Design a protein around this ligand. Structure first.
Ligand SMILES: *[C@@H]1O[C@H](CO)[C@@H](O)[C@H](O)[C@H]1NC(C)=O
Lengths: 49, 50, 49
């Protein structure tokens, strides 16, 4: 199914890890700030309809 | 003599948010695709206001 | 002049506590970190454009 992924290329050029930006709110928050580790707080991510 | 005077100081203003895809486009779906070609202007605007 | 030893000891203990609270990774320098972060996000936006 057509989804958005944030793939992780390592030092040697291979894909080691990825997140699915449509699974949870937390995976969307990971994709929007472009990181795997998030600090504490409140963050705006997207808009709802 | 004893005198009591007043000083008025502003501290804050009204907080505001905007929806770009509703302000610029609305409910349309051709406008959304045409607006995707401009990069992140609306992520940038939402950060500034927030 | 009559309580000089107690005052000198309180000064030295407070200095050591400043040192021990800065060593223990508690983030009290978040303002200079915010300066760094804002400059880097500005340049990331300009290069991504
Ligand atoms: C890259 O490849 C070399 C040789 O195959 C290996 O020794 C090295 O550990 C690899 N680097 C990583 C980060 O896996």
């Amino acid at each position: 199914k057509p989804t958005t992924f944030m793939l992780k290329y390592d030092e040697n050029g291979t894909i080691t890890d990825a997140v699915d930006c449509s699974q949870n709110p937390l995976a969307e928050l990971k994709c929007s700030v472009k990181s795997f580790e998030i600090d504490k707080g409140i963050y705006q991510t997207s808009n709802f309809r | 003599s004893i005198s009591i005077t007043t000083e008025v100081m502003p501290v804050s203003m009204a907080k505001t948010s905007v929806d770009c895809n509703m302000y610029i486009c609305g409910d349309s779906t051709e406008c959304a695709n045409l607006l995707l070609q401009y990069g992140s202007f609306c992520t940038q605007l939402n950060r500034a206001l927030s | 002049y009559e309580n000089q030893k107690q005052i000198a000891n309180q000064f030295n203990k407070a200095i050591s506590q400043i040192q021990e609270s800065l060593t223990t990774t508690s983030t009290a320098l978040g303002k200079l970190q915010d300066v760094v972060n804002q400059n880097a996000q500005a340049l990331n936006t300009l290069v991504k454009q």
